[PDB]
Design a protein around this ligand. Structure first.
Ligand SMILES: [Zn+2]
Lengths: 490, 79
């Protein structure tokens, strides 16, 4: 038995029911990530996600070193390399973690058609999600739950998520060092950002360090008294919450550097101990259940991330305005609360979900009437924890285009900031052209006494953008357009 | 040496300083831009999402049988 475990997500040694599978009958096996660095990356603006991916593989390599093995990044396409890799290695079987998302599925299947017709065995474990998503779907008449309320109900009636596998092996794997070619780094080394086409001069330490190793350490911090209280007990919105938490876990969950299940049965264990209750409210797991919901709402929906062709998305006459979408994307809307969320997003690769809500509102329903599926595009390159299902699902709800949950008033581009962080500490941080402005004026630098803009080294329209629109003006009109879509809706 | 390019949203847009630093959105009329939506909607209201009895019921549990979060004059902070 000689096999291959293929990494795409599930970038982790722990809770890997797929990497476990491959090793049990095996004589000698090898792991792979497959990348064509030459065409992999879509744009100059997407450095954070690729840096995160590459630190992740690098960690995987380090971890696999301690197993006297290494990670094999293979340049090419999962279509051209697989057959060759079959012949050169005589691999008896292939193991990889189930990808639910529509396009992955298709691709995964056509790569199953290939392995079967080449007489190689295949096992998929679904360890990216808590549940077998298909069963949630069959339990509901083989259709996906349309509301979060019904989603919740359906999973309370099913088994509990599988326990984290005891994935990792030493004396039963570490000595599977059959073949050792030292031409290795030259051919299967982990790419650098430059092979991807990114310039890495002047480049600081990643705010969000990749890898399973950073993920597991983060889990532990996440679950200590101070982080617990502040996140799970007395949650309050402060200027500090906007900041990238050292305990944040969303990116690690997305790449699979952390197991969503391990996270699950530890968030439970901590509740059990601290509250002396062995059956916790469902809302405790809220951040995971919403991730599940979406992975579920989209698995049989090839067009989940598009308005038209999507069976659950309201169709709406969004405007085209490429200059507007650009000013938004760049953080040059002229509205400091928005522009600083967009700036943070771009430098760091993460924003707080309410910063997301505010920014999603400004572009869609609130002020510019640009299609949400464009916001999804912008975040797909920028946001560490975005992916097909999670990112589009979220944007549908926020724009008022889907029925996952109760709608809610439009956050204000000027008000909702000064409530959230009155100090203006956040804005001064990400927009240093606006340091010498008093918090009083700062969220609205246009309606602030001219003397100040003169005596603040930045004048509006010259060093900082004049306001894309004015809020009340344009928001007075979209709300009626919004009612119209709903009046005339049956 | 490799040079990736700007993402599509930039390439499709005029992003020189006058657009970035001071482009403004237009000032319009309500009943003009309102009517156009009606026509496009008549096109659109084909997919429109349609559900069935099994699905149509769950919305009542989460939604007011809907203008609730929108039946207002502006948003909620500058009107
Ligand atoms: Zn407002």
């Amino acid at each position: 038995a000689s096999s291959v475990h293929w990494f795409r997500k599930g970038l982790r040694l722990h809770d890997n029911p797929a990497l476990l599978a491959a090793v049990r009958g095996a004589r000698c096996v090898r792991c792979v990530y497959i990348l064509d660095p030459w065409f992999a990356a879509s744009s100059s603006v997407g450095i954070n996600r690729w840096r995160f991916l590459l630190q992740s593989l690098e960690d995987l390599d380090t971890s696999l070193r301690k197993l006297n093995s290494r990670l094999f990044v293979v340049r090419g396409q999962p279509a051209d390399v697989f057959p060759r890799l079959f012949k050169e290695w005589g691999v008896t079987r292939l193991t990889f973690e189930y990808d639910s998302e529509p396009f992955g599925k298709e691709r995964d299947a056509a790569i199953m058609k290939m392995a079967k017709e080449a007489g190689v065995e295949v096992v998929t474990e679904n360890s990216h999600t808590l549940y077998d998503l298909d069963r949630i779907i069959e339990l509901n008449g083989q259709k996906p739950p349309l509301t979060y309320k019904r989603f919740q109900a359906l999973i309370s009636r099913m088994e509990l998520p599988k326990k984290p596998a005891v994935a990792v092996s030493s004396q039963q794997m570490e000595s599977c060092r059959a073949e050792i070619q030292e031409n290795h780094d030259d051919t299967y080394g982990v790419p650098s950002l430059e092979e991807l086409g990114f310039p890495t001069e002047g480049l600081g330490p990643a705010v969000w360090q990749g890898g399973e190793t950073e993920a597991l350490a983060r889990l532990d911090k996440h679950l200590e008294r101070k982080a617990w209280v502040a996140n799970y007990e007395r949650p309050r919105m402060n200027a500090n919450s906007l900041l990238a938490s050292p305990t944040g876990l969303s990116p690690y969950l997305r790449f699979g550097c952390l197991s969503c299940r391990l996270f699950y049965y530890r968030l439970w264990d901590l509740y059990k101990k601290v509250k002396r209750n062995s059956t916790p409210p469902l809302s405790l797991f809220g951040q995971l259940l919403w991730r599940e919901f979406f992975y579920t709402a989209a698995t049989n929906n090839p067009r989940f991330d598009r308005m038209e062709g999507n069976p659950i998305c309201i169709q709406i006459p969004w405007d085209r305005n490429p200059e507007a979408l650009a000013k938004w994307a760049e953080g040059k809307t002229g509205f400091p609360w928005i522009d600083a969320i967009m700036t943070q997003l771009r430098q760091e690769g993460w924003i707080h979900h309410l910063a997301r809500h505010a920014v999603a509102c400004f572009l869609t329903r609130g002020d510019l009437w640009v299609s949400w599926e464009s916001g999804v595009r912008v975040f797909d390159e920028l946001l560490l924890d975005a992916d097909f299902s999670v990112n589009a699902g979220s944007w549908m709800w926020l724009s008022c285009s889907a029925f996952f949950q109760q709608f809610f008033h439009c956050y204000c581009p000027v008000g909702f900031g000064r409530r959230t962080d009155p100090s203006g500490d956040y804005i001064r941080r990400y927009l240093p052209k606006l340091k010498g402005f008093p918090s009083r004026y700062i969220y609205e630098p246009w309606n602030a006494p001219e003397s100040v803009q003169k005596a603040a080294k930045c004048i509006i329209g010259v060093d900082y953008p004049r306001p894309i629109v004015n809020h009340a003006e344009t928001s007075r009109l979209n709300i009626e357009r919004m009612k119209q879509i709903y009046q005339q809706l049956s | 040496k490799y040079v990736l390019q700007d993402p599509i949203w930039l390439l499709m847009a005029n992003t020189d300083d006058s657009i970035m630093m001071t482009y403004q959105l237009p000032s319009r009329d309500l009943q003009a831009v309102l009517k156009e939506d009606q026509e496009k909607l008549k096109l659109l209201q084909r997919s429109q999402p349609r559900f069935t009895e099994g699905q149509r019921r769950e919305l009542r549990e989460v939604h007011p049988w809907l203008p609730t979060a929108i039946d207002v004059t502006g948003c909620v902070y500058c009107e």
